[PDB]
Design a protein around this nucleic acid. Structure first.
Ligand SMILES: [K+]
Ligand SMILES: [Mg+2]
Ligand SMILES: [Mg+2]
Ligand SMILES: [Mg+2]
Ligand SMILES: [Mg+2]
Ligand SMILES: [Mg+2]
Ligand SMILES: [Mg+2]
Ligand SMILES: [Mg+2]
Ligand SMILES: [Mg+2]
Ligand SMILES: [Mg+2]
Ligand SMILES: [Mg+2]
Ligand SMILES: [Mg+2]
Ligand SMILES: [Mg+2]
Ligand SMILES: [Mg+2]
Ligand SMILES: [Mg+2]
Ligand SMILES: [Mg+2]
Ligand SMILES: [Mg+2]
Ligand SMILES: [Mg+2]
Ligand SMILES: [Mg+2]
Ligand SMILES: [Mg+2]
Ligand SMILES: [Mg+2]
Ligand SMILES: [Mg+2]
Ligand SMILES: [Mg+2]
Ligand SMILES: [Mg+2]
Ligand SMILES: [Mg+2]
Ligand SMILES: [Mg+2]
Ligand SMILES: [Mg+2]
Ligand SMILES: [Mg+2]
Ligand SMILES: [Mg+2]
Ligand SMILES: [Mg+2]
Ligand SMILES: [Mg+2]
Ligand SMILES: [Mg+2]
Ligand SMILES: [Mg+2]
Ligand SMILES: [Mg+2]
Ligand SMILES: [Mg+2]
Ligand SMILES: [Mg+2]
Ligand SMILES: [Mg+2]
Ligand SMILES: [Mg+2]
Ligand SMILES: [Mg+2]
Ligand SMILES: [Mg+2]
Ligand SMILES: [Mg+2]
Ligand SMILES: [Mg+2]
Ligand SMILES: [Mg+2]
Ligand SMILES: [Mg+2]
Ligand SMILES: [Mg+2]
Ligand SMILES: [Mg+2]
Ligand SMILES: [Mg+2]
Ligand SMILES: [Mg+2]
Ligand SMILES: [Mg+2]
Ligand SMILES: [Mg+2]
Ligand SMILES: [Mg+2]
Ligand SMILES: [Mg+2]
Ligand SMILES: [Mg+2]
Ligand SMILES: [Mg+2]
Ligand SMILES: [Mg+2]
Ligand SMILES: [Mg+2]
Ligand SMILES: [Mg+2]
Ligand SMILES: [Mg+2]
Ligand SMILES: [Mg+2]
Ligand SMILES: [Mg+2]
Ligand SMILES: [Mg+2]
Ligand SMILES: [Mg+2]
Ligand SMILES: [Mg+2]
Ligand SMILES: [Mg+2]
Ligand SMILES: [Mg+2]
Ligand SMILES: [Mg+2]
Ligand SMILES: [Mg+2]
Ligand SMILES: [Mg+2]
Ligand SMILES: [Mg+2]
Ligand SMILES: [Mg+2]
Ligand SMILES: [Mg+2]
Ligand SMILES: [Mg+2]
Ligand SMILES: [Mg+2]
Ligand SMILES: [Mg+2]
Ligand SMILES: [Mg+2]
Ligand SMILES: [Mg+2]
Ligand SMILES: [Mg+2]
Ligand SMILES: [Mg+2]
Ligand SMILES: [Mg+2]
Ligand SMILES: [Mg+2]
Ligand SMILES: [Mg+2]
Ligand SMILES: [Mg+2]
Ligand SMILES: [Mg+2]
Ligand SMILES: [Mg+2]
Ligand SMILES: [Mg+2]
Ligand SMILES: [Mg+2]
Ligand SMILES: [Mg+2]
Ligand SMILES: [Mg+2]
Ligand SMILES: [Mg+2]
Ligand SMILES: [Mg+2]
Ligand SMILES: [Mg+2]
Ligand SMILES: [Mg+2]
Ligand SMILES: [Mg+2]
Ligand SMILES: [Mg+2]
Ligand SMILES: [Mg+2]
Ligand SMILES: [Mg+2]
Ligand SMILES: [Mg+2]
Ligand SMILES: [Mg+2]
Ligand SMILES: [Mg+2]
Ligand SMILES: [Mg+2]
Ligand SMILES: [Mg+2]
Ligand SMILES: [Mg+2]
Ligand SMILES: [Mg+2]
Ligand SMILES: [Mg+2]
Ligand SMILES: [Mg+2]
Ligand SMILES: [Mg+2]
Ligand SMILES: [Mg+2]
Ligand SMILES: [Mg+2]
Ligand SMILES: [Mg+2]
Ligand SMILES: [Mg+2]
Ligand SMILES: [Mg+2]
Ligand SMILES: [Mg+2]
Ligand SMILES: [Mg+2]
Ligand SMILES: [Mg+2]
Ligand SMILES: [Mg+2]
Ligand SMILES: [Mg+2]
Ligand SMILES: [Mg+2]
Ligand SMILES: [Mg+2]
Ligand SMILES: [Mg+2]
Ligand SMILES: [Mg+2]
Ligand SMILES: [Mg+2]
Ligand SMILES: [Mg+2]
Ligand SMILES: [Mg+2]
Ligand SMILES: [Mg+2]
Ligand SMILES: [Mg+2]
Ligand SMILES: [Mg+2]
Ligand SMILES: [Mg+2]
Ligand SMILES: [Mg+2]
Ligand SMILES: [Mg+2]
Ligand SMILES: [Mg+2]
Ligand SMILES: [Mg+2]
Ligand SMILES: [Mg+2]
Ligand SMILES: [Mg+2]
Ligand SMILES: [Mg+2]
Ligand SMILES: [Mg+2]
Ligand SMILES: [Mg+2]
Ligand SMILES: [Mg+2]
Ligand SMILES: [Mg+2]
Ligand SMILES: [Mg+2]
Ligand SMILES: [Mg+2]
Ligand SMILES: [Mg+2]
Ligand SMILES: [Mg+2]
Ligand SMILES: [Mg+2]
Ligand SMILES: [Mg+2]
Ligand SMILES: [Mg+2]
Ligand SMILES: [Mg+2]
Ligand SMILES: [Mg+2]
Ligand SMILES: [Mg+2]
Ligand SMILES: [Mg+2]
Ligand SMILES: [Mg+2]
Ligand SMILES: [Mg+2]
Ligand SMILES: [Mg+2]
Ligand SMILES: [Mg+2]
Ligand SMILES: [Mg+2]
Ligand SMILES: [Mg+2]
Ligand SMILES: [Mg+2]
Ligand SMILES: [Mg+2]
Ligand SMILES: [Mg+2]
Ligand SMILES: [Mg+2]
Ligand SMILES: [Mg+2]
Ligand SMILES: [Mg+2]
Ligand SMILES: [Mg+2]
Ligand SMILES: [Mg+2]
Ligand SMILES: [Mg+2]
Ligand SMILES: [Mg+2]
Ligand SMILES: [Mg+2]
Ligand SMILES: [Mg+2]
Ligand SMILES: [Mg+2]
Ligand SMILES: [Mg+2]
Ligand SMILES: [Mg+2]
Ligand SMILES: [Mg+2]
Ligand SMILES: [Mg+2]
Ligand SMILES: [Mg+2]
Ligand SMILES: [Mg+2]
Ligand SMILES: [Mg+2]
Ligand SMILES: [Mg+2]
Ligand SMILES: [Mg+2]
Ligand SMILES: [Mg+2]
Ligand SMILES: [Mg+2]
Ligand SMILES: [Mg+2]
Ligand SMILES: [Mg+2]
Ligand SMILES: [Mg+2]
Ligand SMILES: [Mg+2]
Ligand SMILES: [Mg+2]
Ligand SMILES: [Mg+2]
Ligand SMILES: [Mg+2]
Ligand SMILES: [Mg+2]
Ligand SMILES: [Mg+2]
Ligand SMILES: [Mg+2]
Ligand SMILES: [Mg+2]
Ligand SMILES: [Mg+2]
Ligand SMILES: [Mg+2]
Ligand SMILES: [Mg+2]
Ligand SMILES: [Mg+2]
Ligand SMILES: [Mg+2]
Ligand SMILES: [Mg+2]
Ligand SMILES: [Mg+2]
Ligand SMILES: [Mg+2]
Ligand SMILES: [Mg+2]
Ligand SMILES: [Mg+2]
Ligand SMILES: [Mg+2]
Ligand SMILES: [Mg+2]
Ligand SMILES: [Mg+2]
Ligand SMILES: [Mg+2]
Ligand SMILES: [Mg+2]
Ligand SMILES: [Mg+2]
Ligand SMILES: [Mg+2]
Ligand SMILES: [Mg+2]
Ligand SMILES: [Mg+2]
Ligand SMILES: [Mg+2]
Ligand SMILES: [Mg+2]
Ligand SMILES: [Mg+2]
Ligand SMILES: [Mg+2]
Ligand SMILES: [Mg+2]
Ligand SMILES: [Mg+2]
Ligand SMILES: [Mg+2]
Ligand SMILES: [Mg+2]
Ligand SMILES: [Mg+2]
Ligand SMILES: [Mg+2]
Ligand SMILES: [Mg+2]
Ligand SMILES: [Mg+2]
Ligand SMILES: [Mg+2]
Ligand SMILES: [Mg+2]
Ligand SMILES: [Mg+2]
Ligand SMILES: [Mg+2]
Ligand SMILES: [Mg+2]
Ligand SMILES: [Mg+2]
Ligand SMILES: [Mg+2]
Ligand SMILES: [Mg+2]
Ligand SMILES: [Mg+2]
Ligand SMILES: [Mg+2]
Ligand SMILES: [Mg+2]
Lengths: 48, 275
RNA sequence: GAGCUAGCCCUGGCCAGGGUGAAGCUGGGGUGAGACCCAGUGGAGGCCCGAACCGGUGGGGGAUGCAAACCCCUCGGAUGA
RNA sequence: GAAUGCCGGCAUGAGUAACGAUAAAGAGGGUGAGAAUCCCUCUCGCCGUAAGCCCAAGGGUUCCUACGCAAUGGUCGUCAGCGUAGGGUUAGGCGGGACCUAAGGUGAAGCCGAAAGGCGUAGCCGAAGGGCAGCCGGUUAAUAUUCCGGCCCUUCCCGCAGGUGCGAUGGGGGGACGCUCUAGGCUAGGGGGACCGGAGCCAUGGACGAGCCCGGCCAGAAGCGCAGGGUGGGAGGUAGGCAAAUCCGCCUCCCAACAAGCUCUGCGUGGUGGGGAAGCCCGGGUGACAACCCCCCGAAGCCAGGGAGCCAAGAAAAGCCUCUAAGCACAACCUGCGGGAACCCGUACCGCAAACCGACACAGGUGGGCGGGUGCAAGAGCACUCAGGCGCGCGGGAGAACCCUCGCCAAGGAACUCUGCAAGUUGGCCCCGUAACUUCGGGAGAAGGGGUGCUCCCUGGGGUGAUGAGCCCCGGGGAGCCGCAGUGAACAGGCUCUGGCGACUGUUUACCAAAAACACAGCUCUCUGCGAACUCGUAAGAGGAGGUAUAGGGAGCGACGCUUGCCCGGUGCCGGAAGGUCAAGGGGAGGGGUGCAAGCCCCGAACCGAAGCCCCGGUGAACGGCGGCCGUAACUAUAACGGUCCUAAGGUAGCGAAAUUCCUUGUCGGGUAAGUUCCGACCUGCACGAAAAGCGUAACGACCGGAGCGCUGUCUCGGCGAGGGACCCGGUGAAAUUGAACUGGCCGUGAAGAUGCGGCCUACCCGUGGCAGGACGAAAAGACCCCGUGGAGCUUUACUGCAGCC
RNA sequence: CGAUGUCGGCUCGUCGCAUCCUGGGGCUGAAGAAGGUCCCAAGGGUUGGGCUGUUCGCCCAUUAAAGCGGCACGCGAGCUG
RNA sequence: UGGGAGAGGGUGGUGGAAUUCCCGGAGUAGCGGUGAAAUGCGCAGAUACCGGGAGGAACGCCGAUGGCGAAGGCAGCCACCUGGUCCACCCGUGACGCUGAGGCGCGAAAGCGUGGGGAGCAAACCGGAUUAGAUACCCGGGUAGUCCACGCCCUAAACG
RNA sequence: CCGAGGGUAGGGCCCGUGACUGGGGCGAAGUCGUAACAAGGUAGCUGUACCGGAAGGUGCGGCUGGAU
RNA sequence: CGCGGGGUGGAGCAGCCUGGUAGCUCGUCGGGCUCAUAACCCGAAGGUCGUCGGUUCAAAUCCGGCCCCCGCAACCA
């Protein structure tokens, strides 16, 4: 049947993207949180 | 005079449509329509705040002249009589000798080709607007402002009318279409006559789909729900109310008055509504 | 977290073919004028049969499966909420 | 040494199940250490509204070529979407940007919130919508509307020429719009040709023929031709289009008017440039100087912004045109022409799938366009096929049980069973024919029947063309032929009678319930006068609604027909300026403390003092409620009638063993040979009853009952056959489970059901195909049930709070 | 209670005997035929339907007869539901 | 041709008396109702009085024993439209007549449908009395209905 | 070919019969009230509507075939 | 051998709680009015309180048993 993951690049960038994150306090905390952990990628890779 | 159908399908048994026989121009004036944003009942938070609305036919809002004192003493010809899906009444197109064009609410009796006008000097004839203090007592008006220069607010729906009962100083006394007795200010504009399309109430939608064309979505009885949803939810099998019949939000929905008491309008209501 | 899902908003798209024959209009009869009847025309409808499409009624299979809901036969809707 | 412990290693089941659609394979010849599996050939079979083709999304080198084979690939591997390496994606015109707006998003002005932040006009952003200029062919191993070739076109800059009051984010026009139906003319696409071109072919009994087979086009600027779209002209006045305005709007005259003209498309033709088959011979080369014509069918596509009807009344903004203002008229703009300038990103490949979503090369899921021919009435249905693509990445044998899908069956024909579950039957089209009932539409495909192929003969009307032939579409009559059978294959209703419930079409528990449930048009009550009520929010602000009582909210009932009785004492709700009670506050009789005193400080009676409650009323389509005991009629029985107790009032009409009846398979009738069900009745209704509606009701229902006809492997009662598994051999090779095991029957015993103890009996060692009685067999720390001063959801006249309202 | 699946049907049986039938008996208020009642006896047999989920029971048509009970109310790693 | 009388009919207007309700003043101990009463209403200010307002229905005197119409029926007043009828003249047609199975039209009240209206009245219903009872007569209330528009129904002691 | 009739399928009318049910008629001496006849003790009758154990009552309209 | 409530002139009801005290309506009987009957009017009688046992000076009353009557409950699988 139709499963849950239906990839869509515009949906990915506008939702989880860097610029989406930076616009709310909770989003900036995520980035701060992941720079602290040393994550290689701060944000989902999406090609545009 | 409403049009019936033949039972060639189960829904056509009772479906009744407007006669449309007073309508004379089938597409609206391009200079005077504009997009009507469908809300779906949602508010600026994206929240359903009025339930069971959406999915109706597309529409364009026709801009309706609810002032008229804009143009004191400039006559206008009744150019045509048009359908408007945004209100129960029909609308009448007006070509002013000024050259300008506007829309008003079509009153009962108005004919294509007649001239109408507005202002203190105007004749007491159907379609004319006057400040309320200048219309003789006993005269059936409509499209009445509630306060001076604030816009036609009362008696705007198909068939309705307020009748002037008397005067008192700077204020006159109106019997609204509800039957209440209110004092409305003298300088307030209204329009001689009653709104047209009185047969509106005898329309029988006929099938659920008709209400879906109007944007009216299926309504759900509290009795059909669960107690997380409604005072009337739950029970095993069917069930009577089991408390005073109430809204999904708690308050009681049979007889409980809800006009605010200390309202300033109270000093101006004379008698509560009719029947 | 509404890329699953539920509702709404905006903007697009899709629905083989066949069948039934509402109003109206015309003509004819009717009458004081009518209502109305007849025939033709017309092409209405949460109309009918039925693919696409959307469903999931009954039975069987499957049951460490092809599949964490599938397969076969059958069945519902298919210009409309 | 135990924690269904944690981590890791290795066992067991086991050479077992499986190896992923039953579309299907066989040989020859290559290659190579090695071949059922890679390459070539011929043969077979499968898809063909797809299993072919082209886009979009998503994926991200998977593309091409060389070289490989450890792992990946359910086997094999020489092959590969695998490994290494090299190569490959080319644009002013295609798509997106340098253009426009839509929901929504952001957001100078502004508003609001402890902070973070929430709003918000304009403006900005935002597309798969609007707008904007490229078509045919060739080329590469791999790119092409991108390179090349031919013919076209767009914008910007500069210049020249003619022209004109030029000039805009401002005014106006336009852009600009639904659903159904549909005209005229074309085009795409297709069928036929006795004509045109073509390598050839005569087989096996016949055919040298008007024979067979193949192929008979594509693009193209100006012009011209056809068909359509769009569009009145002139003048006078003018206060409106937030300045102006010669534009637009409005009014008046004149002229025009199905037209014409002007303008814009489509189609045709059109200089020119291309393409061009079967076969044969090794993707090529020939055919070939290829021919490139006639007729018919014909779109849902095109002209198009076409037409008509209808109600539910159908985006915006730019480009474009026009008007003028600041200005400026050495300018500037329009038109024609010439030269120059024209950037950024995408382009490979997969793309109904082995490259996307499903942990897999997974029988599932995935939007758009094209989708040939023949026949079957039609069609995207069905069968067979073209182009094209495949035989599904384990095989070879055997021909047990058993399972799965499938075929047939003597006689019977539901006797099966909870139930005709399942499977038969029926089945398209044409004609005849068709009941109760009904809301007059329906019921209706009712039921029930007859016809259907082929041949010859005469003939009626259409479309094309010409009015004719030819082609194409609808028919009619007559005579005949063959078979078991003529919708000979494939696709394609079993019917009827009668009850319950729901009017109906719809909706729903994604993944055990599709229903009688939800919804639904309709009916009633009630709230709401507009800064509405109500909803969301602390607020600002929003929805309501750019609505206005024929409207909006809330609640119940649920098409429609005939109807909806009695109770207001109790609870809710509505009304009540009196009275009773009632907090803060007012008042301050009178008490107190302290001081030398002046003072400072505390307590405090009467009394004035809201809403709420009490009290007085009204109110049922408001929450709700609608009796008991005894007596009585000239046979009996039963009581129309009486007596009396209580209540706020004692169930009305209709209906009733019911989706409700306990006793109950009540009793009687019907149906059957027989009927705990069914239908009709009766009424001592355990325990119907009137909008949690009462009683009916045509039509409707994958609902749930009962019966009958048809017909059957459901059954008596089973038999045979087919294929895919099961079995054998070669290849690969899991699993839950498992204290260890050297693991028999009885009668006893035992924590009460023993392979394991006692006594007897029986029993050589080890497998393989089968069956399921035991191992209190596996699976899931029982959901039932209790317990815990465990948890959570829900309720209320439980408690105590809070929001909200007064 | 870190699970002993729980009614009835179907299928497949197997045992008890307090025997329904068939065989052998005694007593009879046994004339004959037919019964009644106790005794011996478990070898074999013990039907097809209507109704209901039903076990049972009732009913129809037969029969030599249409027995009762045990096996986890025998039997769901055999099926049904 | 000229004339006349009339609640004949349809539409649209409009006048005053009265009942009820609502507001204001004044005012106080009852009012109402009956055969007698009670229910009911009234110190929360009723009744009775004055002034103001709203709404519906019926039209007093004229009015008659009268008039009009085929019947049912029709009554303030104003205007429009429209019917029937009588009379005078003796002008025109020249038997063009009478009745009438069918048909068609009209048709009091009550009643029904969809809207509207609702003061008074009043089936049903409630309460008070009466009574053996009182599902009545009498009293206090009271919904349909009575009224308008449209559409039905088609009855009668529709009678002279 | 036609054809008595035989079969299958569906209609129409008539008759007899049916659990139960509706009113009707009749029946020397039942029960309950007292509606009507006199002003029958509320004049009656009427069409219709609603209601009630039952006659009946009430409303709306009509008739005198009503009395004083 | 569940929890309720009840038993009293002829009928239906009070009295019980809270001991001394039996009451209401109808019915029944006698008298009236009437031609008569009913209605009506005037008077009367009839209950040892279901039964037995205890407490008590004393029991319809309070407690206990036995009898009878009506009512509610009977659930989880
Ligand atoms: K339970
Ligand atoms: Mg889904
Ligand atoms: Mg889908
Ligand atoms: Mg999707
Ligand atoms: Mg995307
Ligand atoms: Mg996208
Ligand atoms: Mg997106
Ligand atoms: Mg973002
Ligand atoms: Mg976001
Ligand atoms: Mg920060
Ligand atoms: Mg790094
Ligand atoms: Mg993130
Ligand atoms: Mg209709
Ligand atoms: Mg109209
Ligand atoms: Mg606009
Ligand atoms: Mg909005
Ligand atoms: Mg917003
Ligand atoms: Mg929402
Ligand atoms: Mg709401
Ligand atoms: Mg909504
Ligand atoms: Mg409206
Ligand atoms: Mg309108
Ligand atoms: Mg005002
Ligand atoms: Mg309606
Ligand atoms: Mg709408
Ligand atoms: Mg609605
Ligand atoms: Mg609802
Ligand atoms: Mg519910
Ligand atoms: Mg529910
Ligand atoms: Mg919730
Ligand atoms: Mg809650
Ligand atoms: Mg709640
Ligand atoms: Mg409830
Ligand atoms: Mg419920
Ligand atoms: Mg219930
Ligand atoms: Mg429920
Ligand atoms: Mg309740
Ligand atoms: Mg409540
Ligand atoms: Mg009001
Ligand atoms: Mg989604
Ligand atoms: Mg997605
Ligand atoms: Mg369709
Ligand atoms: Mg279709
Ligand atoms: Mg047809
Ligand atoms: Mg036709
Ligand atoms: Mg027409
Ligand atoms: Mg059909
Ligand atoms: Mg259908
Ligand atoms: Mg089936
Ligand atoms: Mg199928
Ligand atoms: Mg449908
Ligand atoms: Mg269909
Ligand atoms: Mg240990
Ligand atoms: Mg552990
Ligand atoms: Mg572990
Ligand atoms: Mg581990
Ligand atoms: Mg491990
Ligand atoms: Mg290992
Ligand atoms: Mg092994
Ligand atoms: Mg094994
Ligand atoms: Mg396996
Ligand atoms: Mg497998
Ligand atoms: Mg398949
Ligand atoms: Mg198969
Ligand atoms: Mg071969
Ligand atoms: Mg081979
Ligand atoms: Mg090699
Ligand atoms: Mg190989
Ligand atoms: Mg090999
Ligand atoms: Mg192979
Ligand atoms: Mg090959
Ligand atoms: Mg991937
Ligand atoms: Mg390898
Ligand atoms: Mg290697
Ligand atoms: Mg591998
Ligand atoms: Mg694999
Ligand atoms: Mg090999
Ligand atoms: Mg180019
Ligand atoms: Mg630039
Ligand atoms: Mg805050
Ligand atoms: Mg912050
Ligand atoms: Mg954006
Ligand atoms: Mg775009
Ligand atoms: Mg658009
Ligand atoms: Mg081009
Ligand atoms: Mg190359
Ligand atoms: Mg490549
Ligand atoms: Mg110019
Ligand atoms: Mg200019
Ligand atoms: Mg437009
Ligand atoms: Mg528009
Ligand atoms: Mg439409
Ligand atoms: Mg063709
Ligand atoms: Mg075009
Ligand atoms: Mg050549
Ligand atoms: Mg289309
Ligand atoms: Mg178009
Ligand atoms: Mg806009
Ligand atoms: Mg200059
Ligand atoms: Mg640039
Ligand atoms: Mg490319
Ligand atoms: Mg697919
Ligand atoms: Mg692939
Ligand atoms: Mg997944
Ligand atoms: Mg595979
Ligand atoms: Mg066909
Ligand atoms: Mg294969
Ligand atoms: Mg495949
Ligand atoms: Mg074998
Ligand atoms: Mg066959
Ligand atoms: Mg057979
Ligand atoms: Mg049979
Ligand atoms: Mg048979
Ligand atoms: Mg049967
Ligand atoms: Mg059945
Ligand atoms: Mg069943
Ligand atoms: Mg069949
Ligand atoms: Mg068939
Ligand atoms: Mg019939
Ligand atoms: Mg019929
Ligand atoms: Mg019927
Ligand atoms: Mg009919
Ligand atoms: Mg009809
Ligand atoms: Mg037919
Ligand atoms: Mg047929
Ligand atoms: Mg043949
Ligand atoms: Mg069918
Ligand atoms: Mg339904
Ligand atoms: Mg349903
Ligand atoms: Mg119904
Ligand atoms: Mg119904
Ligand atoms: Mg489900
Ligand atoms: Mg669930
Ligand atoms: Mg689930
Ligand atoms: Mg269904
Ligand atoms: Mg269901
Ligand atoms: Mg539901
Ligand atoms: Mg419904
Ligand atoms: Mg209804
Ligand atoms: Mg209402
Ligand atoms: Mg809130
Ligand atoms: Mg709030
Ligand atoms: Mg708005
Ligand atoms: Mg309904
Ligand atoms: Mg009916
Ligand atoms: Mg009450
Ligand atoms: Mg009360
Ligand atoms: Mg109350
Ligand atoms: Mg305070
Ligand atoms: Mg107070
Ligand atoms: Mg209650
Ligand atoms: Mg109560
Ligand atoms: Mg009734
Ligand atoms: Mg019964
Ligand atoms: Mg029933
Ligand atoms: Mg039930
Ligand atoms: Mg019941
Ligand atoms: Mg029962
Ligand atoms: Mg029973
Ligand atoms: Mg029985
Ligand atoms: Mg009985
Ligand atoms: Mg209820
Ligand atoms: Mg109920
Ligand atoms: Mg029905
Ligand atoms: Mg029906
Ligand atoms: Mg249905
Ligand atoms: Mg259904
Ligand atoms: Mg049957
Ligand atoms: Mg078989
Ligand atoms: Mg062997
Ligand atoms: Mg091996
Ligand atoms: Mg392997
Ligand atoms: Mg061991
Ligand atoms: Mg051992
Ligand atoms: Mg052994
Ligand atoms: Mg042994
Ligand atoms: Mg034991
Ligand atoms: Mg043992
Ligand atoms: Mg042993
Ligand atoms: Mg041992
Ligand atoms: Mg031992
Ligand atoms: Mg031993
Ligand atoms: Mg031993
Ligand atoms: Mg085996
Ligand atoms: Mg076993
Ligand atoms: Mg087993
Ligand atoms: Mg076992
Ligand atoms: Mg165990
Ligand atoms: Mg076991
Ligand atoms: Mg077992
Ligand atoms: Mg645990
Ligand atoms: Mg446990
Ligand atoms: Mg558990
Ligand atoms: Mg327990
Ligand atoms: Mg506790
Ligand atoms: Mg404890
Ligand atoms: Mg607890
Ligand atoms: Mg909790
Ligand atoms: Mg929970
Ligand atoms: Mg509130
Ligand atoms: Mg247990
Ligand atoms: Mg365990
Ligand atoms: Mg276990
Ligand atoms: Mg003898
Ligand atoms: Mg013996
Ligand atoms: Mg034996
Ligand atoms: Mg039984
Ligand atoms: Mg035993
Ligand atoms: Mg037992
Ligand atoms: Mg049992
Ligand atoms: Mg038991
Ligand atoms: Mg089982
Ligand atoms: Mg079982
Ligand atoms: Mg087992
Ligand atoms: Mg008083
Ligand atoms: Mg006072
Ligand atoms: Mg009024
Ligand atoms: Mg003469
Ligand atoms: Mg003469
Ligand atoms: Mg009373
Ligand atoms: Mg009395
Ligand atoms: Mg009334
Ligand atoms: Mg008379
Ligand atoms: Mg015969
Ligand atoms: Mg007697
Ligand atoms: Mg009398
Ligand atoms: Mg009465
Ligand atoms: Mg007491
Ligand atoms: Mg006494
Ligand atoms: Mg005498
Ligand atoms: Mg007497
Ligand atoms: Mg329980």
């Amino acid at each position: 049947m139709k499963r849950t993951w239906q990839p869509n690049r515009r949906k990915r960038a506008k939702t989880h993207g860097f610029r989406a994150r930076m616009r709310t306090p909770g989003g900036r905390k995520v980035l701060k949180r992941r720079r602290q952990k040393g994550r290689w990628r701060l944000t989902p890779a999406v090609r545009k | 005079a409403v049009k019936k159908f033949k039972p060639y399908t189960p829904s056509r048994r009772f479906m009744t449509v407007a006669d449309f026989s007073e309508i004379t121009k089938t597409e609206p004036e391009k200079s005077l329509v504009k997009p009507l944003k469908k809300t779906g009942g949602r508010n600026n938070q994206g929240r359903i705040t009025v339930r069971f609305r959406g999915g109706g036919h597309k529409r364009l809002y026709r801009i309706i002249d609810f002032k008229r004192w804009d143009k004191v003493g400039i006559p206008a010809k009744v150019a045509a009589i048009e359908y408007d899906p945004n209100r129960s009444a029909r609308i009448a197109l007006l070509h002013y000798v000024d050259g300008e064009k506007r829309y008003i609410i079509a009153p009962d009796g108005l004919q294509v080709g007649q001239q109408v006008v507005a202002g203190p000097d105007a004749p007491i004839q159907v379609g004319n607007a006057l400040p309320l203090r200048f219309i003789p007592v006993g005269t059936v008006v409509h499209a009445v402002e509630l306060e001076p220069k604030k816009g036609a607010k009362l008696a705007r729906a198909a068939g309705t009318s307020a009748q002037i009962q008397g005067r008192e100083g700077d204020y006159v006394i109106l019997r609204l279409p509800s039957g209440e007795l209110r004092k409305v200010h003298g300088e307030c504009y209204a329009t001689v006559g009653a709104v047209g399309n009185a047969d509106h109430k005898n329309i029988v939608l006929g099938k659920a789909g008709r209400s879906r064309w109007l944007g009216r979505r299926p309504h759900v009885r509290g009795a059909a729900m669960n107690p997380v949803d409604h005072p009337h939810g739950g029970g095993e099998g069917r069930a009577p109310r089991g408390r005073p019949p109430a809204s999904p939000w708690g308050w009681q929905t049979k007889g409980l008055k809800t006009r605010k008491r200390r309202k300033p309008s109270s000093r101006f209501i004379i008698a509560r509504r009719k029947k």
